[PDB]
Every structure is written in structure tokens, then in C-alpha cells.
Amino acid sequence: SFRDNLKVYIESPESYKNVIYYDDDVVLVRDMFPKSKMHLLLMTRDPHLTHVHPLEIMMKHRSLVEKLVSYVQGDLSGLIFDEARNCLSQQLTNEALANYIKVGFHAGPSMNNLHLHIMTLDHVSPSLKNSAHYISFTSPFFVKIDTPTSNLPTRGTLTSLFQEDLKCWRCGETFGRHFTKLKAHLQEEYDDWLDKSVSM
Amino acid sequence: SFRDNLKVYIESPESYKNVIYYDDDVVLVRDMFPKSKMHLLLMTRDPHLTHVHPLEIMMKHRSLVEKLVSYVQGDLSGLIFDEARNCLSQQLTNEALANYIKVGFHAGPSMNNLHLHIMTLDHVSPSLKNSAHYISFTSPFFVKIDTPTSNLPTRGTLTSLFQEDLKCWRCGETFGRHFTKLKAHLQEEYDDWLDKSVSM
DNA sequence: TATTCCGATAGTGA
DNA sequence: GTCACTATCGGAAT
Ligand SMILES: Nc1ncnc2c1ncn2[C@@H]1O[C@H](COP(=O)(O)O)[C@@H](O)[C@H]1O
Ligand SMILES: Nc1ncnc2c1ncn2[C@@H]1O[C@H](COP(=O)(O)O)[C@@H](O)[C@H]1O
Ligand SMILES: [Zn+2]
Ligand SMILES: [Zn+2]
Hints:
The structure is a homodimer.
Chain A: H1 7-11, E1 19-22, E2 26-30, E3 39-44, H2 54-60, H3 62-73, H4 77-87, H5 94-98, E4 101-106, E5 115-120, H6 131-138, E6 142-144, H7 179-198
Antiparallel strand pairs in A: 1-2, 2-3, 3-5, 4-5, 4-6
One zinc ion (ZN) binds next to helix 7 of chain B.
The structure holds a DNA duplex.
């Protein structure tokens, strides 16, 4: 099944150059179809937990959540900042980058092996090809890792979000269902953010 | 306006080689985007009648209707059969062709100058590019020239027809909204008809 | 709400 | 229910 395509990274991280970190517990791998300039996946290698649904993870596996957050803010932090600098610009400080990075689960994953998204906010990428892509990362469908449990969406209830009009995450401008126009606007927004950030 | 594009044929038939007949009253011209192997347009040159709606023509201009039918079945008959033989096969008799030709108006024309369609039944043509094309010629939207007045459709009421599933005019097989599949089938139907027609 | 291919659908400009 | 261009939307296979 295509839904098992990510399992090779937790079973054999030794075989993939795009696995930029691995140990006995987790694997950090570049997303093969990045939806932002930087887009990484942090996966548990635990044979049970990998097949637990992300909402269940958030709800009842707080130890794992804390452990993943600890990797991101600790031992993997330098690595992620370098990836970000390489994908965006060397001129961006850790401070600026930290405010331009989001971390979370999809409420309804396509791939069956639990994977935490770690990505920049730009959504400027050739692999961002349709409205559903964009909305899945910029709506409640993207469940940020620090979402309080009481504020989690219910499994299977977010279907309707994908039919809504497109809105820029940064400035709020709307684009109806004109994905191509959103795309061009996202590029401008990035150029703007970049210019303002280095110039700080 | 694009809707006046046919007026050049009745104003200056002398300037167009695809005007295969003209006199003071009418012009017979090849359709620039034929929706069947043979597709011709018979147009009145009368400055008033040209802008009368075809349903009004059918209803209240029986003299013009009779005159057009007289052209088709008389002075233009040999010409039309030669056009058909050239577009289909030299091996087809007038008798076979007469049963493979339809003559009528669109109930809701796009072009403003009254034009009677004269075309073969095949609907095998590169210019047949969408479902609306096919449906407009194979449903009550196509108002055959011998339709009794009491059986005419009402002006502006047939919009819903274009949303219906596709059905082969010859054998009845349905194709949902799969136009490409209908197209391939129409090709087969023609090959079948041709084979059966010349074979006797 | 995996990707990719293909085709149907929809708005536009002329 | 002009044509032609572009882009969105929709299923199917993988
Ligand atoms: N073979 C692959 N290698 C790496 N990442 C992939 C592969 N196939 C799909 N992906 C990514 O995996 C992610 C699936 O996330 P989700 O929608 O939460 O299941 C998407 O961001 C895809 O771009
Ligand atoms: N410039 C043109 N010359 C000849 N026929 C044309 C031209 N433009 C459009 N047509 C045809 O005119 C017909 C219009 O028919 P209707 O839909 O009844 O208005 C269609 O069959 C078109 O293919
Ligand atoms: Zn914006
Ligand atoms: Zn058939």
C-alpha cells in the first residue's frame, strides 16, 4: 500500500541519505514532496506507536509528545536550523527562524506511520500543487504539537474545511478557489518576509 | 461580436470558397467547425428574417420554411449528396445518404444570423470536442425542419438537457459524462454503418 | 486530507 | 447551446 511508504525510514534509516537523524527511538527525514521551503518529518520507530492515530497520540500519549518536542527543541534544534538556513537563507538567525517554523500532525494522515511535520511557514514550493495541500497545513486540520488536549479536533470531522475559500496565512487576503493566484501571492509574501527579516 | 460571425456569408458570399451555393435569397456554406463528417449551414439572406429566432421562424414563417426545404430537396440536393460522398464515401448512394442526413435549427443558437444545419448523423469529427456539442444535435434542442409546430420546444427552456448523461444516437448505449469514450464509440458506429451501407 | 495521469468542468476573453 | 485558453475539479491506479 502507498499508505505504508514511510515505513522504510523507521525500519532502515541507514539506507537513506535524506534521513538527517536517527537513533533507536526516532527518525528525522526530509519530506519527499515539501509543501514549504523546509519540510521535515519526525517519526517514532516504536512498532506500536507508529500505528497509533495522531489525535490519540496527542490525547493519551503525552510522554511521546513530550519526547518529540524535546528532540525538536533540543538535540535536533541545531540540525533543523541549518536545514532551514539552507532551504531559505543563511542570513536568517535562529530567532527569526523559530518564529517561521511550525510543528504539528495532520488530523487525518494519508500515510499510516506516525509522522510529525516540521516545516517553515512560507508554503513556497513546487510540490504545493493544490488547494487541499495548502489548507491541510494552515487550518485546524494541522494540529500543532502544543495544542491543549481539550482543544483537539475530533477524528474524522474536518472534511468540510477543504471546500472553503483560500486565505493567505500571513496577511489574510482571500483568493476564492484561485489556487494559482494564491501561489503567486505566497511567493511575494515570502520575498517580503525575507527582506524584512534579514534587514532587522 | 462573435455572434455576428456568420453575417459575412450572406453579405459577401462571393468572397468565400466554402460558400458552395448562393443566390439572391440563400447561401449554403460549410460549417467551419463541423460536428459531423458533413456539416453545412443554409442561411437566408433576407435582412429581416436573418435576425428572427429559429423557433419564431418555425412557428410563423412557414413560407420560408417551405422555401428552405425546397432548396434542400431540390436545387441543392445533388450538391449536398456530392458533399456527403466526399466527406464520407464515394460508395454511398443517394438513398443511403438521405437516411443519414438531418436538417434542423438549434433551439438556442449562438450565432445571430438564421442558419439551418444540414449534416450527416455520424458525429465523427475533430471539431466535436465536448458533451454540449453532441447533445445540442441529438436532443430536442435540435429542432428538425419537419417538426410540427405544435411540437416545438419553448424558447429558453432546454438548459437542463446539457447536464444529462451521454447516449449514443444509433444504438442507445449510455456513457455517463465520459465524452472521450462516447467519441471512440461514435467512430466504431460509423465504421459499422459504412461497412453495412456499402455492402449492398 | 500520498502522487500522477487523464479527462470533465468552469470562467474568460474575443 | 461560437472557439480557445487556462485552471480547477474529479475519479482511478499505484
Ligand atoms: N516516499 C516518501 N518519502 C518521504 N515523504 C513522503 C513520501 N511519500 C509521501 N511523503 C510525504 O508524507 C507526508 C504525508 O503526511 P500526511 O498527509 O500527514 O499523511 C506528505 O507531506 C508527503 O509529502
Ligand atoms: N466563422 C465561421 N464560419 C462558419 N461556421 C461557423 C463559424 N463560426 C462558428 N460556426 C459554426 O456555426 C454554428 C453555430 O450554430 P448555432 O449553435 O445554431 O448558433 C456552429 O455549428 C459553428 O460550428
Ligand atoms: Zn498575504
Ligand atoms: Zn452506439
